[PDB]
Design a binder for this molecule. Structure first.
Ligand SMILES: *[C@@H]1O[C@H](CO)[C@@H](O[C@@H]2O[C@H](CO)[C@@H](O[C@@H]3O[C@H](CO)[C@@H](O)[C@H](O[C@H]4O[C@H](CO)[C@@H](O)[C@H](O)[C@@H]4O)[C@@H]3O)[C@H](O)[C@H]2NC(C)=O)[C@H](O)[C@H]1NC(C)=O
Ligand SMILES: *[C@@H]1O[C@H](CO)[C@@H](O[C@@H]2O[C@H](CO)[C@@H](O[C@@H]3O[C@H](CO)[C@@H](O)[C@H](O)[C@@H]3O)[C@H](O)[C@H]2NC(C)=O)[C@H](O)[C@H]1NC(C)=O
Ligand SMILES: *[C@@H]1O[C@H](CO)[C@@H](O[C@@H]2O[C@H](CO)[C@@H](O[C@@H]3O[C@H](CO)[C@@H](O)[C@H](O)[C@@H]3O)[C@H](O)[C@H]2NC(C)=O)[C@H](O)[C@H]1NC(C)=O
Ligand SMILES: *[C@@H]1O[C@H](CO)[C@@H](O[C@@H]2O[C@H](CO)[C@@H](O[C@@H]3O[C@H](CO)[C@@H](O)[C@H](O)[C@@H]3O)[C@H](O)[C@H]2NC(C)=O)[C@H](O)[C@H]1NC(C)=O
Ligand SMILES: *[C@@H]1O[C@H](CO)[C@@H](O[C@@H]2O[C@H](CO)[C@@H](O)[C@H](O)[C@H]2NC(C)=O)[C@H](O)[C@H]1NC(C)=O
Ligand SMILES: *[C@@H]1O[C@H](CO)[C@@H](O[C@@H]2O[C@H](CO)[C@@H](O)[C@H](O)[C@H]2NC(C)=O)[C@H](O)[C@H]1NC(C)=O
Ligand SMILES: *[C@@H]1O[C@H](CO)[C@@H](O[C@@H]2O[C@H](CO)[C@@H](O)[C@H](O)[C@H]2NC(C)=O)[C@H](O)[C@H]1NC(C)=O
Ligand SMILES: *[C@@H]1O[C@H](CO)[C@@H](O[C@@H]2O[C@H](CO)[C@@H](O)[C@H](O)[C@H]2NC(C)=O)[C@H](O)[C@H]1NC(C)=O
Ligand SMILES: *[C@@H]1O[C@H](CO)[C@@H](O[C@@H]2O[C@H](CO)[C@@H](O)[C@H](O)[C@H]2NC(C)=O)[C@H](O)[C@H]1NC(C)=O
Ligand SMILES: *[C@@H]1O[C@H](CO)[C@@H](O[C@@H]2O[C@H](CO)[C@@H](O)[C@H](O)[C@H]2NC(C)=O)[C@H](O)[C@H]1NC(C)=O
Ligand SMILES: *[C@@H]1O[C@H](CO)[C@@H](O[C@@H]2O[C@H](CO)[C@@H](O)[C@H](O)[C@H]2NC(C)=O)[C@H](O)[C@H]1NC(C)=O
Ligand SMILES: *[C@@H]1O[C@H](CO)[C@@H](O[C@@H]2O[C@H](CO)[C@@H](O)[C@H](O)[C@H]2NC(C)=O)[C@H](O)[C@H]1NC(C)=O
Ligand SMILES: *[C@@H]1O[C@H](CO)[C@@H](O[C@@H]2O[C@H](CO)[C@@H](O)[C@H](O)[C@H]2NC(C)=O)[C@H](O)[C@H]1NC(C)=O
Ligand SMILES: *[C@@H]1O[C@H](CO)[C@@H](O)[C@H](O)[C@H]1NC(C)=O
Ligand SMILES: *[C@@H]1O[C@H](CO)[C@@H](O)[C@H](O)[C@H]1NC(C)=O
Ligand SMILES: *[C@@H]1O[C@H](CO)[C@@H](O)[C@H](O)[C@H]1NC(C)=O
Ligand SMILES: *[C@@H]1O[C@H](CO)[C@@H](O)[C@H](O)[C@H]1NC(C)=O
Ligand SMILES: *[C@@H]1O[C@H](CO)[C@@H](O)[C@H](O)[C@H]1NC(C)=O
Ligand SMILES: *[C@@H]1O[C@H](CO)[C@@H](O)[C@H](O)[C@H]1NC(C)=O
Ligand SMILES: *[C@@H]1O[C@H](CO)[C@@H](O)[C@H](O)[C@H]1NC(C)=O
Lengths: 128, 439, 128, 128
């Protein structure tokens, strides 16, 4: 189960191996120049793509983690399934298509309603 | 009970090799491709640290040699050429007040502004630039049948500005401050620096000029002394001063060769003609080889007659000493520094020859024409070292004979980079402790 | 005590300065091109080497720290020393050679036995 | 309120939008080479500037956060104001000039007096 491994398995299993895939995300002198830039155009790309996901998880409060849990009540109209027909019977590759259009609705209901609210309450407790 | 704990930022290292930069304070050197230097370098003593160095498996020397020869090639891309320079070029002897046929008065046809009209011009050439083919005498330019000749642009300075190599992040440079270091073995005094000290790329042969002096004695270093196919590097603890002049007082002419191209030639001689020379004193020199004999006598034993003798054959590049004073390339005969045997205001004039079409790197199919300079050259340098080589042959433990060695530019630099070693930092590390994560 | 500083001192001291060394881990136009790539080949290198260590510490649960402690019982056969003959009497430079061959045995006994186990137990407590 | 947004507002408000500005911090073949390096000289620059701030916050103990609080008693001689004349009546752009000369005095009184001290006390509690 290397790169992408259990891509057929149910979502219920599939996630006991997340670190396995997290570690993978990162005299002819004129010809020696062009073919050097073609390597740097890719090496710099993976560093930007790694860092633009970790920031997103820093602003959601889940910095330095791989699984986390939020404080955002799931809506009924985000999918009409059960608790189990998603984990035990679907894959992530299929689930990504299911709620693809609902992504940025969730990502706003994270940060601006979850973490700004709790961060303001922390300074109240320190001031106490 | 013990548990694993993790430490990040731990001062351990490994040996590694990498591409170093350049740093310094319209020359072909430093001003083009370097960065501004560190105004305040540091030198961190590391007490109790003992490393082992090896100056002959160091790779700082070979990658510097790569980067030096690249600078002389990537700079001369925009420097005209001299494809039309080759001509039958009838020539005579210069008739001036001459104390001596080592300078000739040639004449040849070249193209004028219009590319349909002949133009009969002339200039001076040294004896070494002129080849006889077969009435009067028809000569050919040298290195026409092998290579193509490129004139080094007469606006570019060549003066050796010192170089400071600096390591990038995640690396470090060590330095062996102690003495009595024959390039290998341990080192009790190690420090840590950001940048190597001043390195001045000076392309000499058989005698090291403007180098770094030794500490107390003459330091003799070689890979193996019983191996004859190796060079021996001597390093002086006191300089010996040398003075090269020439009474030239030459002139500069120019010939337009195509639209927007210019060829700088030698004009005429305003004065008399005398050869060049180079003076060394017979007291600081004769009591320097005594010090070298004393350290050579220590390796080979006692009751070893040590002879010095000149170079036994080869190209002009390896049997003479070649300077660069002011933008001219000399070839001086040094077979009078080394003519001596050792058992138990007077100076030496070293004659010299000058050539204008040279081949600095002993390559194939490359040449460059050195433009002349106006005025008389007077350059003072001091000698800090010798490159020796030993003759093999018969088993008589009565006499050894040493000759000047040469044939490699990677020995001018190995004499200077024997102090450093590039390491690699590894920040992670575990160790056991009495500490438990409570969940 | 700059770069690498107390490299002679015992491991027992030697580590009160870890942040000091953590901050150090990060018309001739054709010639102007070659000598530009030789700078980017080094600047991109230190960014990859920094990020490939922080990830390793994210997956070990010690994200955002410099000293941490795990939950992995040290084995007797990993070195036959005392508690004190390692800290008070050896250096890190020597200790790195001591257990050099035993590195990836430890790094597997981290992550797959330490942090996967605790992370699964957290969702049990949330579900309670 | 996009880039730099509330730059006129008082410091008291001004900081409910910090994540908004945190996400912004990151045959002619010879001409095709020069104008490629001019892009990499900027893309690599923003990655270094992002990472040289997150490290500074890792060593201050405030890793993975945006607002944090320290344990460093503010000195009277660092400004002679009130609690309120700084937040309700000044801007950050003006406040940056106020204590500009006092920056590295604070940054040393962070790390070497705040986090080294607490980190040594943690291993005491584990050893208990
Ligand atoms: C190292 O030193 C040795 C001396 O110990 C030196 O060997 C000598 O080299 C010279 C040339 O450099 C040789 O001299 C030749 O001697 C012959 C006699 O056999 C002469 O006829 C030669 O005359 C030539 O030049 C004339 C013009 O000057 C011409 O008109 C004539 O036709 C000849 O071409 C020439 O002088 C000499 O034989 C040796 N050996 C000795 C014992 O002198 C050696 O060259 C030095 N090494 C280096 C690299 O210079
Ligand atoms: C090398 O030989 C060349 C040609 O043989 C010399 O060039 C020539 O030098 C003579 C000097 O007698 C010039 O003659 C005089 O020139 C002036 C001005 O041109 C003129 O007014 C006089 O009546 C007389 O003719 C001659 O012009 C000049 N050029 C040519 C093409 O012949 C050269 O001087 C010699 N080299 C050296 C170092 O002297
Ligand atoms: C060994 O090191 C010395 C020290 O730098 C070198 O001496 C210097 O050589 C240069 C050669 O160009 C001299 O420059 C010339 O100076 C005269 C008069 O000052 C001036 O008319 C010229 O335009 C030119 O600038 C310089 O004076 C001289 N001495 C110093 C700097 O003290 C020597 O050349 C080195 N040896 C070799 C082989 O490079
Ligand atoms: C480098 O210098 C050496 C040392 O002077 C040169 O060797 C000497 O060269 C000259 C002329 O080539 C020799 O002079 C001749 O000697 C014979 C001996 O009978 C004499 O009959 C001639 O009239 C003439 O004077 C000299 O002997 C010779 N050797 C010495 C002094 O030991 C050498 O030629 C120079 N090398 C180069 C490449 O120029
Ligand atoms: C691939 O799909 C197959 C579908 O047969 C999965 O195999 C079994 O599927 C049934 C019903 O979906 C489950 O009740 C079983 O537990 C599954 N496993 C076995 C061993 O019978 C299979 O799990 C899927 N994934 C992989 C990686 O094979
Ligand atoms: C320089 O150019 C002149 C002019 O072309 C050459 O003079 C010719 O020389 C040849 C040689 O035999 C004669 O056959 C021609 O009759 C000459 N032409 C003229 C117009 O004089 C001359 O040879 C060239 N080279 C030199 C060295 O002077
Ligand atoms: C280029 O021309 C020079 C002209 O001197 C050649 O040098 C001579 O070549 C012949 C033929 O091999 C030799 O016998 C001579 O000894 C050489 N030297 C001299 C001074 O005449 C040279 O060989 C030519 N280059 C090539 C590659 O043939
Ligand atoms: C080298 O030659 C030039 C001439 O090309 C000399 O220049 C002369 O210098 C003197 C002063 O020393 C002036 O009075 C003359 O007017 C100059 N002549 C010209 C034509 O400009 C120069 O002095 C010579 N250098 C020496 C003798 O070493
Ligand atoms: C180089 O060394 C020679 C060796 O003595 C010096 O020699 C003579 O010096 C006088 C005084 O100027 C002259 O008249 C002679 O012509 C010189 N002879 C020779 C062979 O050079 C000379 O002065 C020294 N010169 C330098 C510049 O060092
Ligand atoms: C090499 O050149 C130096 C510098 O000129 C000479 O040293 C000077 O020699 C003269 C002799 O006329 C003395 O008066 C000076 O005191 C010397 N020193 C200085 C600093 O000028 C040296 O003599 C030359 N060596 C030779 C000719 O072999
Ligand atoms: C090299 O060594 C030889 C051997 O001693 C020297 O030859 C003698 O030199 C002296 C003075 O130079 C002459 O009086 C003798 O006549 C020479 N010997 C013979 C047999 O003629 C030679 O001079 C030395 N050369 C140098 C440059 O030191
Ligand atoms: C370098 O090694 C020396 C070894 O002498 C250390 O100095 C003392 O070593 C003894 C026994 O190892 C200890 O009991 C002392 O506490 C050490 N310190 C002093 C001041 O005497 C030294 O600590 C080592 N490190 C450095 C950086 O010097
Ligand atoms: C820009 O400055 C103005 C100054 O008038 C601010 O507007 C009011 O300022 C007074 C006194 O400073 C406060 O009591 C009010 O609460 C401010 N707001 C309003 C709506 O009256 C204003 O807040 C500043 N900032 C911006 C973004 O406009
Ligand atoms: C659930 O989603 C619908 C539309 O997607 C929205 O109108 C509704 O307010 C959401 N429910 C809650 C409780 O927010
Ligand atoms: C001219 O020089 C050649 C070689 O340099 C020589 O053979 C010839 O004798 C010289 N002639 C005169 C007149 O100087
Ligand atoms: C050269 O050195 C030796 C040993 O010092 C000495 O005997 C000899 O006379 C010296 N020669 C000259 C010319 O100084
Ligand atoms: C060689 O000679 C030196 C002269 O100082 C002497 O000290 C040394 O002991 C000798 N060595 C041998 C092996 O004879
Ligand atoms: C060696 O030469 C340089 C430059 O010619 C000179 O400045 C220096 O004083 C000389 N002597 C030394 C370094 O002993
Ligand atoms: C200790 O290591 C040995 C071999 O290195 C291994 O066989 C043994 O199981 C380890 N002990 C424990 C308790 O895991
Ligand atoms: C406050 O600052 C002054 C100078 O800036 C300093 O001398 C003083 O010790 C500081 N106060 C405290 C309590 O550290």
């Amino acid at each position: 189960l290397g790169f992408l491994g259990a891509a057929g398995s149910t979502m219920g299993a599939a996630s006991m191996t997340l670190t396995v895939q997290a570690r993978n995300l990162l005299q002819h002198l004129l010809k020696l120049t062009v073919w050097g830039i073609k390597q740097l155009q890719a090496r710099v790309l993976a560093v930007e793509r790694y860092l633009r996901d970790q920031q997103l998880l820093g602003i959601w409060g889940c910095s330095g983690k791989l699984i986390c849990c939020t404080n955002v009540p799931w809506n009924s109209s985000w999918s009409n399934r059960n608790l189990s027909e998603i984990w035990d019977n679907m894959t992530w590759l299929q689930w990504d298509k299911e709620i693809s259009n609902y992504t940025q609705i969730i990502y706003g209901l994270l940060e601006e309603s979850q973490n700004q609210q709790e961060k303001n309450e922390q300074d109240l407790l320190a001031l106490d | 009970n013990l548990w694993v704990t993790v430490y990040y930022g731990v001062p351990v290292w490994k040996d590694a090799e990498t591409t170093l930069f350049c740093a310094s304070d319209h020359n072909i050197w430093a001003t083009h491709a370097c960065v501004p230097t560190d105004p305040n370098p540091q030198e961190i003593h590391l007490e109790n640290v003992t490393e082992e160095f090896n100056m002959w498996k160091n790779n700082m020397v070979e990658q510097m040699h790569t980067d030096i020869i690249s600078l002389w090639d990537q700079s001369l891309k925009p420097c005209v050429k001299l494809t039309p320079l080759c001509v039958t070029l009838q020539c005579t002897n210069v008739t001036n007040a001459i104390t001596d046929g080592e300078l000739k008065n040639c004449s040849f046809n070249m193209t004028t502004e219009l590319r349909d009209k002949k133009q009969k011009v002339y200039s001076l050439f040294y004896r070494l630039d002129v080849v006889q083919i077969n009435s009067n005498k028809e000569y050919r330019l040298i290195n026409c049948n092998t290579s193509a000749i490129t004139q080094v642009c007469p606006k570019l300075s060549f003066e050796p500005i010192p170089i400071h190599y600096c390591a990038p992040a995640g690396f470090a440079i060590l330095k062996c401050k102690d003495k009595k270091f024959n390039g290998t073995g341990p080192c009790p005094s190690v420090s840590t620096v950001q940048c190597t000290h001043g390195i001045k790329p000076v392309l000499s042969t058989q005698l090291l000029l403007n180098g770094s002096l030794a500490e107390e004695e003459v330091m003799i270093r070689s890979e193996n002394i019983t191996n004859n196919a190796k060079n021996i590097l001597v390093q002086f603890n006191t300089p010996v001063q040398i003075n090269c002049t020439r009474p030239n007082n030459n002139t500069r002419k120019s010939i337009r060769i195509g639209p927007g191209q210019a060829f700088y030639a030698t004009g005429d001689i305003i004065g008399d003609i005398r050869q060049a020379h180079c003076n060394v004193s017979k007291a600081t020199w004769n009591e320097t080889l005594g010090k070298v004999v004393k350290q050579l006598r220590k390796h080979f034993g006692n009751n070893t007659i040590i002879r010095f003798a000149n170079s036994s054959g080869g190209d002009l590049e390896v049997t003479t000493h070649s300077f660069n004073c002011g933008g001219e390339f000399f070839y001086c005969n040094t077979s009078g520094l080394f003519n001596s045997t050792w058992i138990s205001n007077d100076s030496i004039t070293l004659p010299c020859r000058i050539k204008q079409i040279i081949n600095m790197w002993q390559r194939i199919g490359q040449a460059m024409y050195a433009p002349p300079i106006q005025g008389v050259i007077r350059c003072v340098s001091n000698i800090t070292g010798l490159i020796l080589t030993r003759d093999g042959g018969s088993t008589n433990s009565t006499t050894e004979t040493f000759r000047p060695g040469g044939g490699d530019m990677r020995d001018n630099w190995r004499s200077e980079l024997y102090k450093y070693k590039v390491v690699k930092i590894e920040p992670l590390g575990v160790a056991p402790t009495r500490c438990k994560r409570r969940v």
